[PDB]
Amino acid sequence: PKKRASNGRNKKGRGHVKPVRCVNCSKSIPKDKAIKRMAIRNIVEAAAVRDLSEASVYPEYALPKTYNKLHYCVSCAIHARIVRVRSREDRKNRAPP
Amino acid sequence: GWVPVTKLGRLVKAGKITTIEEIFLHSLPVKEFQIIDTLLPGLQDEVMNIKPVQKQTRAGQRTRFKAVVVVGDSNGHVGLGIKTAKEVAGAIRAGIIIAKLSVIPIRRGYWGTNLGQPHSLATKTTGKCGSVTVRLIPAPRGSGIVASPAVKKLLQLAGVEDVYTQSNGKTRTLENTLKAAFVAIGNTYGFLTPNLWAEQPLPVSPLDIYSDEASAQ
Amino acid sequence: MENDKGQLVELYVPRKCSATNRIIKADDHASVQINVAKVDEEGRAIPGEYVTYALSGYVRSRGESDDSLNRLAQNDGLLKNVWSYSR
Amino acid sequence: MRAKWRKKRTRRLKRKRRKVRARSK
Amino acid sequence: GRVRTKTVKRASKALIERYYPKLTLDFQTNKRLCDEIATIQSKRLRNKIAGYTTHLMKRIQKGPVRGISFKLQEEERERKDQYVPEVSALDLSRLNVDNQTSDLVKSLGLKLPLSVINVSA
Amino acid sequence: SLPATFDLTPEDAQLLLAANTHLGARNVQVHQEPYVFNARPDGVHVINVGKTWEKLVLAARIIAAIPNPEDVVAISSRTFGQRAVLKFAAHTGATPIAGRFTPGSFTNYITRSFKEPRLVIVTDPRSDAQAIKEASYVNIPVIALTDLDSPSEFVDVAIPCNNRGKHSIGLIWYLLAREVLRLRGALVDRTQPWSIMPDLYFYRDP
Amino acid sequence: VLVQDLLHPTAASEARKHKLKTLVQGPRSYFLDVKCPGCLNITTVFSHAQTAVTCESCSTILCTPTGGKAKLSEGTSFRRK
Amino acid sequence: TRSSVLADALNAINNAEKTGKRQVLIRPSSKVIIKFLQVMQKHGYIGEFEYIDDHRSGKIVVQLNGRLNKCGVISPRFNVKIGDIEKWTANLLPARQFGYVILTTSAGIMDHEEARRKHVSGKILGFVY
Amino acid sequence: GKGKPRGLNSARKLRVHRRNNRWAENNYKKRLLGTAFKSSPFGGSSHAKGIVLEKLGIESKQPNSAIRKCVRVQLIKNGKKVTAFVPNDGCLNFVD
RNA sequence: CGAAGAUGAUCAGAUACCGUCGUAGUCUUAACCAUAAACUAUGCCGACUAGGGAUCGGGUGGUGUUUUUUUAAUGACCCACUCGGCACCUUACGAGAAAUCAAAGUCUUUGGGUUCUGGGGGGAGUAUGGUCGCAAGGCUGAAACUUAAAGGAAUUGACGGA
Ligand SMILES: [Mg+2]
Ligand SMILES: [Mg+2]
Ligand SMILES: [Mg+2]
Ligand SMILES: [Mg+2]
Ligand SMILES: [Mg+2]
Ligand SMILES: [Mg+2]
Ligand SMILES: [Mg+2]
Ligand SMILES: [Mg+2]
Ligand SMILES: [Mg+2]
Ligand SMILES: [Mg+2]
Ligand SMILES: [Mg+2]
Ligand SMILES: [Zn+2]
């Protein structure tokens, strides 16, 4: 039976968007379905800031950041515990926590 | 002599409410079954189906026993209630209890020229429980109960003498068929015929008028 | 209903909803009957003497039995300027 | 028997049955 | 490991309900008068009942304990609750009324004092 | 039916216009635009307090029509009405329920909170919904202190009042007990104020 | 609302409807007696006028067509109907 | 599209009779709508209905009081003889003692009981009870 | 309008559509194609005499387990080969 | 990048996953094909029935911000409406077997108009015949025979290298 109203994706009015590649296993997956997380890490680690801080010219310099949009497939985002299958009443929630 | 709780039942053991038609008129929830025993003493019960439903456990099968029981006097009141119990004593005896609390009247009528003593119903009414749909149709005299013997017994105990039956869905599902029949005989009073178009004084309940020999502090 | 020889035979005339004219029937346990006491000079109870309305379960459950009673009590005089006909 | 995989078995037999009539003609 | 069963806590709560102007914050007299006012089949059972009941009173002397009702707190708790403030709330200190609040009072036709202040948007 | 003396006295309006009872919600339910008067900037909706009184007098006419005064059950789960419901309960007959309602009260005749009111008054139809829903099973009319954003399903009588402040809730409960006692043999004259002050219905901290 | 008066609705509740969905549909547009700054002569311009209307003297524009009402030419006095 | 405006009249009535309304609005006001509404009026099923003469085709506001359970169209307008009115009314109407099946007839748009008295017949429009 | 055309002049489109969808029944497709006489060894009849060739013992289907004691019969009227059950306790000794 | 194919490991076996290559293909031009879980498994048109807020595009009105610099264009934003759309949320009057659905409602109280399709499961989208295509195949499309269940939705358990 129809498990989700929005079937697995975000497509009510297209028929077709474009596919994207899963960054784990290179599965071709539609972009509206895929699963998207934004990873904004600091460049080094939080643990290694003070070592790079003392051993640097340019005091309080920038500590830059690494941004990358990650598209997963459903098989790879479940296995990497990103979406973590919910209950029948819970899965209707559309807020991040 | 049963210590009535529930104010309406306190008036009924008193003798202040003599008719169940006054309960029906103000739509009062009968929660105590001795209200029905005293007001409708000539009441007969027929136990029909004792089907055992079963529940799967880690091991074994626990076969509880359902019951459908129709109570009714053949002057225009029946009830119907389902009792799934561990034993068929508690299925039958408490099934008669739940049958009595649901007792509702039927608006008998005429196919008819209006020569005396209503023999039939006054309206084609339907009732839908599950896939089952039951239509009851007014019928001329001597028609008998043209119904399946499940729906025939519910209408015999409601005192209908002449009625036609359409059916749909799984009438072999016995619970839904009588439940859909019960909605059909229940909607006989819900149907606004032209002789009910007269504006009525909208009276005062016994629980307002007799508010001191009820509500025993 | 009556038979041929007079004899109003019914077994019971049901009440009506005062707002939507439906039959209030023996299982409508969402249906109410409100008694509103008439009031004598300078504001007492007149015990026993009511301005009585009945609402079926449908007009309540639709959320309209508020404004049903607003209209039903305004024309009886009980309310003065709460309900306006031209909505 | 996935019905798609029964199909490509059948489409194989669709060719062979119209081969054996062209064989005899 | 010292959580008490419902049969200790019901019987303790049933003692507080009908024997508050009796047994006090001492365990030893609570132990001894549960011999007369209750029929308890064991000495070990009686002492657990008498001890939680003793624990209950020590809680009652600082505030009521929910799940327990008797009159000795009931006419106490209303006597805290009859207090009226003489701060004259719902009396005018000097009545803040907006423009579309002044239009309402005018359209009721009544006599009120107001103070007209615009709303910042 | 109400001669001239049941008009909103301007001394009652100083109570209602200073307890912030006129400030309604930001979202008006379609069953409540009767009660709305001329929306203010920053979305403030002004309830007509004249229509508040006439519903309140009508409510008291319903309350002073049940011959036992005790089976007028009054409900308040929210704390802002919790003092006010008990002060309503002491002055009139008025079997109170303050705080949690314990479902199975109107039905479920074997319970220890088993009641059969002939009338229920609630403070918020949102929070007291278990009382309002269970009133729909045993034919009980419901009066309700309603804001403009509140569900009117199975609410027969709706007193349009602000439910955000504490003074607005407490005032309406005070005047509701008042007109019941005024419209029977308990507070005989209609023209003097009650010496029972409005602020004994009001919530306090701590 | 279960009882209302569709025959005589509120006139504010009539201006808050589409020009078709009212009780008697009709135009919400109008005509304007427009004067140029150059002279005194009188033209009649529709609301949603779809046309760069030119007068006798200032024969360039008096209103510019837009997607709705025509915007008048910023020096021209108008008067309704 | 809009083929039978009688259905556009008689579905706006049932949809608001069911929801307890004391009024409907009917668009677009045929004569057949009016002379259906007049038969429903004269037998006790609606109240006053008022026709709004706009300059196109008419709106109609009907005051529905409370007495109506079902009104509807039998589409297409079947040729009804005089010996099948007792088969047409026996299928649409709940009991014999009340309810009316509305015919079209060259003697006029009319219900079935007096069409049996007038000994006339014709096409069928619908029913009311 | 629930599928079908309702109109007065649409009696043909309903009648064509009925015959079209009438073929999906089991008896109408059998009776109108005449498979009783063409196929079906008893060519539309109820009883047919035949000549006994053989006595077969057919295994009964699982979960039953018995030998069913039929015979093999060539029909006199048609020459077709059929298997015929011999129903009672015994009675295979009665045939030949 | 990669049907095929070559090759490297493991597995008891691998004519498979995985690693490295790699023809056809993937791109295009000019012609064929005509199928997709071609899906919203929901024909198209029309009417009515219930509240909400957000967005898109269009329009109307603010002596509203924005350029607060004397009686401060235009865009953008804010607020209220209505027109149309993609959706959604809440309830469930109704509907259904339920999952759910303001449509899948206005349906035994069965008739707004109209097109196509289905008739227990297989055999079988098979045979044959016609037709279309360079072909792969497409469209139309059986019967004999066999079968007492197949299936749908939800419940409880059980089990999951969840
Ligand atoms: Mg699944
Ligand atoms: Mg697609
Ligand atoms: Mg068709
Ligand atoms: Mg390609
Ligand atoms: Mg296809
Ligand atoms: Mg399809
Ligand atoms: Mg299509
Ligand atoms: Mg829209
Ligand atoms: Mg088949
Ligand atoms: Mg085909
Ligand atoms: Mg072929
Ligand atoms: Zn000029």
Side-chain angles (χ1 to χ4, degrees):
Chain A
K2 202 185 174 160
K3 194 168 164 232
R4 302 155 172 76
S6 173
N7 298 278
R9 57 190 296 166
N10 201 353
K11 190 187 71 52
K12 295 256 169 82
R14 275 72 181 172
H16 189 257
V17 182
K18 202 58 79 179
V20 289
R21 311 307 300 275
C22 168
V23 301
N24 198 344
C25 78
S26 283
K27 183 177 171 67
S28 189
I29 189 164
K31 189 174 134 66
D32 65 309
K33 195 192 159 126
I35 289 183
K36 270 166 295 277
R37 296 306 178 239
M38 192 55 168
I40 305 168
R41 313 289 50 81
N42 185 27
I43 182 69
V44 292
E45 201 156 80
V49 171
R50 43 200 170 100
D51 294 316
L52 276 296
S53 307
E54 61 86 30
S56 175
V57 69
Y58 322 129
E60 72 265 1
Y61 166 64
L63 304 154
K65 265 174 169 309
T66 42
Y67 305 69
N68 61 6
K69 215 179 191 189
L70 266 72
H71 319 260
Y72 290 83
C73 77
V74 177
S75 287
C76 283
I78 288 186
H79 179 82
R81 328 190 164 283
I82 310 166
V83 290
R84 205 93 58 79
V85 64
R86 304 200 275 192
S87 87
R88 177 164 212 91
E89 294 294 328
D90 182 3
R91 59 168 73 111
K92 293 199 168 195
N93 178 34
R94 274 192 59 114
Chain B
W2 320 117
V3 177
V5 66
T6 68
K7 291 159 147 51
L8 167 79
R10 272 197 278 281
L11 283 183
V12 160
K13 325 298 167 84
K16 302 292 107 179
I17 295 159
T18 44
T19 185
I20 201 162
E21 286 81 42
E22 172 76 330
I23 301 184
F24 294 149
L25 193 140
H26 299 97
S27 46
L28 290 176
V30 176
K31 308 213 160 304
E32 198 184 313
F33 77 97
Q34 298 75 358
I35 299 172
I36 314 295
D37 291 331
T38 67
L39 293 179
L40 286 177
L43 201 79
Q44 313 263 20
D45 46 342
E46 272 273 331
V47 65
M48 294 182 286
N49 181 27
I50 310 168
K51 89 159 172 193
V53 300
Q54 293 179 356
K55 195 214 170 198
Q56 193 84 301
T57 307
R58 157 68 208 157
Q61 48 94 32
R62 175 32 51 101
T63 182
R64 282 201 282 103
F65 282 81
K66 204 172 203 169
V68 292
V69 181
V70 162
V71 301
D73 52 343
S74 309
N75 290 318
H77 318 89
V78 297
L80 181 56
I82 59 169
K83 180 68 177 177
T84 183
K86 267 178 169 165
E87 75 289 346
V88 308
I92 283 167
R93 286 146 196 57
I96 299 150
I97 301 316
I98 306 164
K100 283 184 197 168
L101 299 185
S102 61
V103 162
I104 197 164
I106 59 165
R107 185 166 146 78
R108 294 176 277 180
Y110 295 105
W111 181 87
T113 179
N114 63 6
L115 187 150
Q117 295 298 109
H119 56 102
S120 183
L121 312 180
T123 299
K124 294 186 224 187
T125 53
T126 188
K128 185 197 158 95
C129 177
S131 85
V132 193
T133 296
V134 169
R135 196 185 195 157
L136 293 170
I137 304 106
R141 313 186 180 254
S143 300
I145 310 298
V146 189
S148 48
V151 178
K152 178 157 158 98
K153 194 70 71 71
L154 174 57
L155 285 151
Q156 201 163 29
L157 273 188
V160 185
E161 274 169 45
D162 295 303
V163 66
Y164 287 140
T165 304
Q166 298 286 97
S167 297
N168 206 28
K170 293 203 63 147
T171 60
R172 303 158 85 243
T173 295
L174 184 48
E175 285 76 39
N176 295 31
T177 292
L178 295 162
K179 284 179 67 158
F182 205 62
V183 179
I185 55 187
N187 276 264
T188 52
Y189 263 115
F191 203 96
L192 190 58
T193 66
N195 45 9
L196 310 183
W197 291 357
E199 161 56 15
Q200 283 285 328
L202 204 65
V204 183
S205 81
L207 277 300
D208 208 299
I209 291 168
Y210 300 157
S211 64
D212 307 284
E213 68 274 16
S215 164
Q217 286 255 334
Chain C
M1 77 174 45
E2 306 97 318
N3 60 37
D4 56 332
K5 283 196 309 202
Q7 307 176 316
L8 187 72
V9 64
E10 212 168 10
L11 179 62
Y12 165 57
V13 162
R15 296 183 289 127
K16 282 189 179 50
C17 176
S18 45
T20 63
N21 221 42
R22 324 170 81 270
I23 296 169
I24 296 159
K25 66 184 289 184
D27 49 23
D28 189 5
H29 291 323
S31 75
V32 308
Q33 182 178 317
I34 284 188
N35 302 290
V36 175
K38 304 173 271 283
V39 167
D40 46 49
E41 188 145 31
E42 63 97 25
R44 304 291 171 100
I46 308 174
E49 290 326 290
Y50 313 121
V51 178
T52 295
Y53 303 101
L55 309 168
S56 52
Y58 173 83
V59 56
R60 302 197 72 216
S61 68
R62 274 310 271 271
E64 297 287 349
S65 77
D66 191 20
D67 215 20
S68 276
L69 203 54
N70 277 42
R71 169 194 42 109
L72 273 157
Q74 179 155 328
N75 56 12
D76 278 327
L78 300 176
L79 291 167
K80 284 63 201 173
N81 304 107
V82 287
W83 168 65
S84 165
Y85 184 56
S86 79
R87 286 287 276 270
Chain D
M1 294 298 102
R2 179 180 178 183
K4 167 191 182 190
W5 299 143
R6 206 171 61 247
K7 186 181 182 184
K8 190 181 287 292
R9 182 204 275 185
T10 293
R11 303 275 212 76
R12 222 173 322 279
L13 190 48
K14 294 278 293 294
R15 303 191 203 198
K16 300 272 279 188
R17 265 182 161 166
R18 72 181 177 263
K19 183 252 285 181
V20 76
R21 262 164 81 82
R23 181 177 175 86
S24 168
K25 169 171 54 185
Chain E
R2 300 296 226 279
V3 190
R4 271 73 62 91
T5 303
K6 58 180 80 62
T7 187
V8 164
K9 293 186 180 183
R10 293 179 293 173
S12 285
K13 277 163 192 92
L15 282 165
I16 302 299
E17 190 271 332
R18 57 167 77 84
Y19 286 105
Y20 191 85
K22 290 303 278 190
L23 62 87
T24 187
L25 293 92
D26 189 359
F27 165 69
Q28 307 288 330
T29 187
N30 287 7
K31 150 181 68 183
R32 265 296 203 280
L33 62 84
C34 287
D35 284 356
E36 301 190 13
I37 78 176
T39 300
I40 298 169
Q41 308 274 323
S42 179
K43 186 215 291 175
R44 189 160 162 251
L45 185 50
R46 170 210 79 211
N47 296 321
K48 292 182 183 292
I49 289 171
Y52 192 57
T53 302
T54 300
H55 173 70
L56 279 187
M57 310 305 218
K58 301 194 67 202
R59 286 211 51 229
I60 287 171
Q61 322 294 280
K62 187 65 189 71
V65 167
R66 54 211 161 181
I68 288 296
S69 302
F70 48 90
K71 52 181 60 64
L72 283 72
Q73 58 173 13
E74 205 270 329
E75 292 83 4
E76 172 36 69
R77 279 290 83 79
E78 51 205 278
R79 266 191 269 106
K80 298 296 289 183
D81 197 71
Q82 323 194 80
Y83 158 83
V84 307
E86 323 313 318
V87 73
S88 298
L90 268 60
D91 181 276
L92 75 164
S93 76
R94 167 223 44 85
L95 181 54
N96 195 358
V97 162
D98 263 344
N99 274 327
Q100 303 174 240
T101 313
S102 75
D103 293 316
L104 177 72
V105 166
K106 173 180 194 298
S107 66
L108 272 179
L110 295 187
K111 278 320 285 161
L112 277 296
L114 321 171
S115 182
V116 169
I117 279 164
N118 285 321
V119 192
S120 67
Chain F
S1 300
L2 295 174
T5 78
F6 287 78
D7 200 350
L8 190 69
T9 55
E11 87 188 72
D12 274 299
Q14 309 217 41
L15 289 178
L16 286 148
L17 274 300
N20 289 316
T21 70
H22 61 295
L23 301 197
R26 312 293 297 270
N27 266 33
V28 171
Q29 164 174 128
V30 68
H31 291 151
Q32 303 274 120
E33 301 107 0
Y35 304 136
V36 190
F37 184 100
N38 294 37
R40 298 213 323 277
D42 187 74
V44 188
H45 285 325
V46 178
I47 320 172
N48 185 4
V49 298
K51 314 163 75 86
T52 311
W53 190 244
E54 300 182 357
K55 295 287 306 164
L56 189 75
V57 177
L58 169 68
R61 289 185 70 171
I62 301 147
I63 302 172
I66 305 107
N68 296 276
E70 57 90 19
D71 44 2
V72 186
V73 166
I75 308 285
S76 180
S77 303
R78 296 164 59 192
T79 70
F80 284 168
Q82 268 196 281
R83 196 183 185 212
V85 60
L86 286 155
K87 296 295 183 67
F88 184 99
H91 303 154
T92 55
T95 312
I97 296 170
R100 199 181 171 275
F101 170 72
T102 311
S105 307
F106 301 148
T107 57
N108 205 16
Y109 73 80
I110 80 168
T111 50
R112 84 291 181 281
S113 167
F114 171 54
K115 293 181 181 180
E116 321 188 83
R118 307 281 278 159
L119 182 76
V120 161
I121 300 92
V122 305
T123 312
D124 191 10
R126 297 270 191 79
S127 58
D128 293 329
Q130 177 60 44
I132 291 174
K133 174 194 101 142
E134 184 177 1
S136 160
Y137 287 60
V138 293
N139 297 90
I140 291 180
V142 165
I143 319 176
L145 277 74
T146 58
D147 213 337
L148 308 183
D149 52 12
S150 69
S152 63
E153 291 56 30
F154 298 103
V155 166
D156 296 344
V157 184
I159 312 164
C161 63
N162 174 40
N163 286 359
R164 263 76 152 205
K166 54 192 182 323
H167 289 353
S168 171
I169 293 182
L171 174 59
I172 308 284
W173 272 113
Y174 160 54
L175 317 170
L176 186 75
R178 191 169 83 172
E179 320 305 298
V180 172
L181 295 178
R182 290 183 179 178
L183 292 154
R184 66 194 184 183
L187 197 59
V188 290
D189 180 81
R190 284 270 313 167
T191 317
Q192 290 96 23
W194 206 14
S195 51
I196 286 301
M197 172 165 188
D199 309 353
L200 62 86
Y201 275 70
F202 289 179
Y203 192 77
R204 199 195 295 102
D205 279 330
Chain G
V1 309
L2 193 146
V3 169
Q4 74 198 93
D5 192 57
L6 312 162
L7 277 299
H8 302 89
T10 300
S13 177
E14 286 288 283
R16 291 305 102 163
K17 294 183 81 33
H18 194 233
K19 75 170 182 194
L20 296 176
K21 283 190 171 317
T22 60
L23 195 57
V24 176
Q25 67 153 287
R28 309 263 186 80
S29 49
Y30 54 84
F31 291 78
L32 298 168
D33 291 331
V34 186
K35 296 183 289 294
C36 53
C39 197
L40 198 69
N41 200 292
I42 310 297
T43 183
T44 288
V45 182
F46 195 40
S47 310
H48 312 77
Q50 296 189 15
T51 307
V53 184
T54 42
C55 83
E56 292 98 4
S57 64
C58 189
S59 313
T60 300
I61 209 164
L62 272 80
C63 76
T64 314
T66 66
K69 299 199 182 187
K71 302 301 103 183
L72 301 194
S73 158
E74 277 91 12
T76 45
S77 178
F78 64 110
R79 185 281 291 171
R80 192 162 169 146
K81 264 262 171 173
Chain H
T1 76
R2 198 183 307 259
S3 68
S4 192
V5 306
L6 192 67
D8 267 6
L10 266 67
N11 192 261
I13 284 169
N14 270 322
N15 272 345
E17 164 269 332
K18 274 323 182 283
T19 64
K21 312 269 164 34
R22 283 275 149 160
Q23 78 283 4
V24 304
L25 189 151
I26 278 174
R27 189 184 68 183
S29 179
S30 186
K31 265 193 304 304
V32 189
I33 287 173
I34 287 279
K35 313 192 75 63
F36 209 108
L37 281 177
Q38 291 201 153
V39 180
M40 280 206 286
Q41 202 172 44
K42 65 151 293 172
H43 287 300
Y45 281 106
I46 54 172
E48 161 172 49
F49 61 92
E50 183 177 1
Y51 158 81
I52 300 106
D53 189 358
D54 54 5
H55 272 168
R56 290 129 171 102
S57 168
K59 310 196 177 197
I60 293 179
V61 180
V62 189
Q63 306 280 314
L64 282 71
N65 62 7
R67 274 91 71 71
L68 174 56
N69 290 355
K70 194 61 180 284
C71 76
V73 168
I74 298 289
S75 193
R77 293 158 185 186
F78 285 102
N79 304 338
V80 185
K81 299 209 172 304
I82 210 164
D84 47 5
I85 308 190
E86 61 265 350
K87 304 312 180 293
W88 260 121
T89 68
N91 285 358
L92 309 179
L93 302 181
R96 324 168 89 241
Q97 299 94 337
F98 75 101
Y100 293 149
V101 162
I102 319 300
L103 316 180
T104 317
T105 295
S106 53
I109 286 177
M110 65 182 73
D111 62 357
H112 86 271
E113 293 293 328
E114 54 86 27
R116 294 201 72 276
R117 311 196 309 255
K118 279 198 185 145
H119 208 84
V120 295
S121 186
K123 288 161 188 312
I124 187 167
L125 294 174
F127 43 82
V128 65
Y129 63 93
Chain I
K2 211 204 273 187
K4 57 183 84 168
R6 290 200 190 285
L8 271 179
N9 296 352
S10 77
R12 178 174 295 124
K13 172 59 68 69
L14 296 173
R15 210 166 49 111
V16 170
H17 190 276
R18 175 54 46 227
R19 285 186 297 167
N20 288 343
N21 289 259
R22 188 76 185 273
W23 285 110
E25 311 176 10
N26 273 47
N27 280 267
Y28 175 91
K29 180 73 158 276
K30 176 185 297 302
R31 186 171 63 242
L32 270 293
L33 298 186
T35 73
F37 302 106
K38 299 163 178 270
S39 315
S40 83
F42 286 26
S45 55
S46 77
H47 292 55
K49 274 185 220 193
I51 187 55
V52 172
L53 321 172
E54 214 173 20
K55 304 181 168 203
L56 314 173
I58 305 299
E59 70 89 36
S60 48
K61 299 179 159 197
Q62 283 313 329
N64 295 41
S65 160
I67 301 299
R68 290 286 93 189
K69 264 82 156 182
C70 313
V71 290
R72 190 95 182 146
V73 161
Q74 177 151 38
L75 295 179
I76 289 176
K77 93 155 172 185
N78 199 358
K80 296 195 178 192
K81 292 277 173 77
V82 295
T83 310
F85 196 89
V86 186
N88 263 320
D89 192 4
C91 284
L92 197 79
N93 63 6
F94 274 135
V95 191
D96 276 330

